[PDB]
Amino acid sequence: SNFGAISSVLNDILSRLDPPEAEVQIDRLITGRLQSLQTYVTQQLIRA
Amino acid sequence: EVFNATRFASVYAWNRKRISNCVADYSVLYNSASFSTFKCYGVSPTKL
Amino acid sequence: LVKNKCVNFNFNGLTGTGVLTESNKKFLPFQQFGRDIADTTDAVRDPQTLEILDITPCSFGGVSVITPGTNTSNQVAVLYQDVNC
Ligand SMILES: *[C@@H]1O[C@H](CO)[C@@H](O)[C@H](O)[C@H]1NC(C)=O
Numbered sequence: 001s002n003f004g005a006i007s008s009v010l011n012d013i014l015s016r017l018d019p020p021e022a023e024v025q026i027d028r029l030i031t032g033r034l035q036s037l038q039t040y041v042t043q044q045l046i047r048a
Numbered sequence: 049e050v051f052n053a054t055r056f057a058s059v060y061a062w063n064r065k066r067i068s069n070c071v072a073d074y075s076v077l078y079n080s081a082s083f084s085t086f087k088c089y090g091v092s093p094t095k096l
Numbered sequence: 097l098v099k100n101k102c103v104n105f106n107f108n109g110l111t112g113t114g115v116l117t118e119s120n121k122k123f124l125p126f127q128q129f130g131r132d133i134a135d136t137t138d139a140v141r142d143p144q145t146l147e148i149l150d151i152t153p154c155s156f157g158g159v160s161v162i163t164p165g166t167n168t169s170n171q172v173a174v175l176y177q178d179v180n181c
């Protein structure tokens with residue numbers, strides 16, 4: 001998924017932007033992936 | 049041959065030029081202070 | 097070129113790391129990229145000698161500690177999860 005960033009690959013975006021400018025885009029990916037992981041953890045907790 | 053042209057066409061008859069199959073040194077573009085406005089959209093200047 | 101070792105590399109502007117090996121699958125004379133389900137590049141066409149190479153990440157590993165309790169004796173044992181000794 002893209003989650004609203006310019007690219008979905010961390011290395012590609014990290015290799016094409018100034019780090020002060022890049023710090024505003026990694027946060028979206030981090031938030032999206034964390035929110036994705038939490039749901040799976042909760043579902044496994046219920047199934048057990 | 050683009051930045052040193054003698055005469056520039058009108059804004060309603062702008063001309064486009066194609067660049068391919070060569071090597072580029074963009075340093076001279078961002079090293080000289082002659083330019084007044086120099087903006088990069090989507091990429092960093094140095095990383096070019 | 098150098099193979100058979102986990103190395104850092106970049107191809108035509110794309111960066112990456114891992115071990116690169118020769119490929120057996122047949123690549124079309126115009127394609128350049130090989131992608132998996134997770135959208136990660138794994139097949140690269142060399143732009144100088146025109147060969148196909150496959151990238152694989154090197155060993156992950158996993159470390160666990162078996163202990164009988166420091167209250168009795170200060171000794172431990174180590175367990176590697178997937179390392180093939
Ligand atoms: C035109 O070319 C000369 C040398 O080729 C260079 O010194 C000058 O900066 C160029 N003009 C520009 C980039 O506007």
Ligand SMILES: *[C@@H]1O[C@H](CO)[C@@H](O)[C@H](O)[C@H]1NC(C)=O
Nearest residue numbers: 097141142143144145146147
């Ligand atoms: C260098 O260019 C020549 C083409 O004349 C060819 O050998 C190859 O495409 C390139 N690389 C090497 C290692 O020679």
Ligand SMILES: *[C@@H]1O[C@H](CO)[C@@H](O)[C@H](O)[C@H]1NC(C)=O
Nearest residue numbers: 164165166167168169170171
């Ligand atoms: C430590 O081990 C000894 C030996 O069994 C035991 O008597 C003791 O309760 C343990 N804990 C402490 C705090 O000494």
Ligand SMILES: *[C@@H]1O[C@H](CO)[C@@H](O)[C@H](O)[C@H]1NC(C)=O
Nearest residue numbers: 155156176177178179180181
């Ligand atoms: C583990 O290592 C042994 C000894 O080299 C080898 O025979 C065996 O095939 C290996 N197994 C795996 C799963 O790598």
